[PDB]
Design a protein around this nucleic acid. Structure first.
Length: 212
RNA sequence: UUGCUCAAGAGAAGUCAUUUAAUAAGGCCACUGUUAAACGUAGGUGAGUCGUGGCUUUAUGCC
């Protein structure tokens, strides 16, 4: 079998807001599989979200990012008038600083060719042939990606904080997100285990599937 | 195309008005640089202005 594609990721600032965190911008410690899947789709310029269902992703944290809060005058659709003062509310948003991680992409379960792994490999091979819009970001549109590159299993050859699918884990990261409400959002429970493995364990792989 | 797409904590504000580190104080009192000698005899030099004036025989020297 083809070795799973490894994508080194370095982001200066990242906000993985929680699904139920609407009054305050609480963030996940680790990028959810849904956010990484959306980032990869943006990287290959794929607008359709159902195109690459079945891809498996594994995330290894190269360091523990620090959590910080920033005030923000975020807008909302509360009043019909755009200039009404009710449309602006001040609330906190939690950000993560200096996020470095390695992403494993495995595309054995995809039924549509070419697979997401092949598309990412081709995009990195010939960047001038990639047809996409906007700037690559992880989280919010203003949180641009500093370094995204093809790496090996030992890019830093140090110690890795894996995200293991544990039913007793603390984090509840979604592998599918319903942006309207929460009906179609699908969750999985993870834990961050400090391990010196250079390849993801079996429980570290998360398959992105439709809620159906 | 990422719980995403959009998103200024923004506009304004003197740390101000007043306050002697001031009043007093000897670095003072004492001290010998005392005592003695043969010059026996042999060591040198760095810097201008230009055509007769008072004496005197031109002379040639004085001021």
């Amino acid at each position: 079998m083809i070795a799973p594609l490894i994508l080194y990721l370095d982001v200066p600032f990242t906000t993985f807001r929680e699904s139920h965190a609407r009054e305050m911008g609480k963030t996940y410690p680790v990028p959810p599989p849904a956010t990484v899947y959306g980032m990869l789709l943006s990287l290959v310029g794929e607008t359709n979200v159902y195109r690459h269902c079945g891809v498996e992703l594994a995330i290894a944290m190269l360091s523990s990012p620090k959590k910080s809060r920033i005030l923000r005058q975020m807008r909302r659709f509360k009043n019909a008038d755009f200039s009404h003062p009710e449309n602006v509310i001040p609330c906190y948003q939690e950000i993560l600083s200096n996020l470095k991680c390695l992403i494993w992409v495995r595309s054995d379960e995809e039924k549509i060719q070419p697979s997401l792994r092949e598309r990412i490999q081709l995009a990195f091979d010939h960047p001038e042939l990639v047809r996409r819009f906007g700037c690559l970001f992880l989280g919010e549109s203003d949180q641009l990606i500093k370094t995204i590159k093809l790496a090996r299993e030992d890019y830093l050859e140090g110690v890795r904080q894996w995200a293991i699918r544990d039913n007793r884990g603390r984090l509840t990261l979604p592998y599918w997100v319903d942006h309207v409400g929460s009906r179609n959002t699908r969750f999985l429970r993870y834990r961050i285990e400090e391990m010196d493995r250079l390849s993801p364990p079996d429980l570290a792989w998360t398959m992105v599937q439709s809620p159906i």
